[PDB]
Amino acid sequence: SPQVLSAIIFIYFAALTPAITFGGLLGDKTENMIGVSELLLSTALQGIIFSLLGAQPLLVLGFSGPLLVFEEAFYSFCQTNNLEYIVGRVWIGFWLILLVVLVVAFEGSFLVRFISRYTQEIFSFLISLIFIYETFYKLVTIFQDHPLQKNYDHDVLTTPKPQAALPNTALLSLVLMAGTFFLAMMLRKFKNSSYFPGKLRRIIGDFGVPISILIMVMVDALIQDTYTQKLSVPEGLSVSNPTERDWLIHPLGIRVEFPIWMMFASALPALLVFILIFLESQITTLIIFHLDLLLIIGMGGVGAIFGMPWLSATTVKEQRISGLLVAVLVGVSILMGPVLRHIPLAVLFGIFLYMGVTSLSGIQLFDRVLLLLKPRKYYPEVPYARRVKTWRMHLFTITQIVCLVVLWVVRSIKQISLALPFILILTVPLRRFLLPFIFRDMELKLLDADD
Template identity: 25%
Template sequence: MSQFVPGRGIYTDIKTRLIPYYVSDITDGFTYRVIPAAVYIFFTNILPAMAFAQDMYDHANKSYGTNEVLLSSAMAGIIFGLFSGTPLCIVGVTGPISIFNYTVYNLMEPRGTPYFQFMCWICLWSMVLHFLVAITNSVNFMRYVTKYSCISFGLFINIVYIQKGIQILAHQFAIRDDSSGFASIVVALVMALFGLAAHFFGTKSHYVHPLFRKFVKDFGTPLSVVFFTGFIHFGGRLKYVDFARLPITRSFRPTSPDRPESWYIPFWQDISVGDVFLALPFGILLTILFYFDHNVSSLMCQSDEFPLKKPSSFHYDFMLLGITTGISGILGIPAPNGLIPQAPLHTEALCVHEHDYATGKDRVVRVVEQRLSNIIQGLLTLVLMTRPFLVVLGQIPQAVLAGLFFIMAIGALNENEVVQKLRFLFTDPLSRENMGFPRHYFLLQRKWFLIFLALQLTAFGFEFGITCTKGAIGFPGVLMFFMILAIYFPTFIPQDQMRMLDSQAADDLILKSLKFEKNE
């Protein structure tokens, strides 16, 4: 007879994943693939985070800035690289947490509640709740999460990235003149064009040698950032354009003028007992957000499309996330969690491909499963907090951030299943056979194909819609609702159709730690 064993999930993760594979996680990292993966994920992690820093800087009265986001991202990369059971999962500052942070500010500032103390209590409550969720093995519920939730959420994140890119460009007209605004649009669009061209050249074309194509794919995005940062200095008419750049502050110092030089937040001072307990419901919302966001990121970077050989860790990693959440509150920085789309992009960057000349396509033969690339990108982020590199960071035009958002979003959207289904619907039926669509699209009954697509678009619509309202803080509840709703799809969709429409998010090797038998 099964029985509840507190901490069983954490114990299983440490016993079956962390301890047996820790040495190989280091030694397996001594290979070339780690270098481009670390460089690529460093750029795709830190530059969007800078845009979120700008978002919080503008909407929360300079409470968070470049240094806070750098410190949060560096801490997350180093701690999860060194100690997590899923080092492939990239952890950092996300769009949802930036929305959460400035929404809390807008709610609490009129009450006169000290913001950093209140946020610290939110994070401390959330840390306790993370521990409770992990100890009670409640992360097990993630075994019921299917690709429906992951794909819908991935679509949401990519559309938000496009939205953020547009917002950055629109903001240029407000903080600079029209010439800067229009020039920024051109720089962002041309950068996106080149970045996406590099990606498609490296993955879809058959020109030149596969090794060169792989190099272009590995370094195309970072080189686009470097090139277009220098592009504004090329002279000509550009020298008359006043491009807005990333705002920077003193090295290793907090941004907000309302807090002391120290990173430590005296969370027991100047805050009432009532506000301490008022922080609890916010802590619950933050925990729900991280429960979904982080674990889905972990599932996506260990998706069954990647031939992974090492098992996973969910309960232990969620407890570790609780620790970083509590530390973030005490330091007065945004709490980091799993990143979409960066986490699966990290795994993709670590894939070793082999060119099959018989089919003319590259195929993935293995994934370099290690923890060095995560640690390296975390250390590189920490180095950015030193003055020389802060100055370099301050030279990046905000238009380049917009271009990077477009590259990441459009590249990921092209592979998103919802977009593929929409493309299938609007493709000439006589041409579908030669367009490379999945075979099950042709076997599905049109009725259930359309119903399931509508359900995916509905989830996306509600997720995106609530973030555009004053009720944005309720975003975690929307995520949880659709995750639970997906469990009931088999009650009204025929089983033969359901098997083709949806499936578990990862294979049995990865989900093993979520399916352990409590009576073993």
């Protein structure tokens, strides 16, 4: 039916873009062991298995930025001491498996009733903050990679990697930073701005991100006489750097034997993986049980058998086939490697920055953050601050920003890391106990009263 045909391409584009940009980040955060092809492969098998067995097959199991934070944090930690990044994460998946059985006998969803607006918005806010900083962190590296000078080198070989600083890349990327980004919100504004006959506007407005990936690549295609850092994608049914990773991975390691004391020391990073997906799992279910949640946990460790990163829940009879059609097209997407390798890495980051910006506008916590600099004579009439004195909201925001500041510090230090969720989960009792000690319940029922 035409309704299905229009819908399937729409959702396929919705799942197509995040996988590409997420892998490029991992392709950069990891040396080359984790890239795009495997992630494009994982979501293909992920779609079919959840569609067959799932309480809500219309849901989508995508990837999340918060998930990506853990792997890079582990990757930095795995670089602090001599360890195998892929092999170590494989052992983590084994630990997750035994956690599933512990929840199989008795559910552990009691923490769902203990989630709060003060908790879920304070978590998403810093995620967007990490997104913009990482993009800004690259241009600093790019500047150091290609310091500005006068053409002085001749014919530097760059097929594996640019071996020397060369012109016309440090500032071409900067244009690629803005050109992709500047075209983004205007399409977003176009969708939110009268133009083409009603539906005639939103048809392309809903595909603004999918359509704003070709304009600069065509410009990139139009510019072949200048090098751009592009995707390092292997051929079909191949692992990026097969000399470094394979489809089958030996748990004791491929090149170096894994340390003996690390098989049973992987429990700690394993529970954190469960925590981060668990909190995100309920957010996507708020649009409207245990079996659906627990299955996601089990299939998460399934990927670690082949050394594969896990996925996460995302937004939204023929419900079964809807997940089937999207999954198979994702699998076929690996077959156009040569044509998708022409897209440079710079295009991804502008989109990646735009990802956090869109999520930033959807957070009500930021809405009162800007009110701090707003004078107290033009505040919007929202029925949560009209009955409360002005200085009270600012005190509450102070309690919020300090949580962001300490979270900012913990991730920044390379020595003490991988504890970011650990310091985050303990904020809930502070909301449950410390916050009522300072603010009235009637006052509290307007600040973090989630709908």
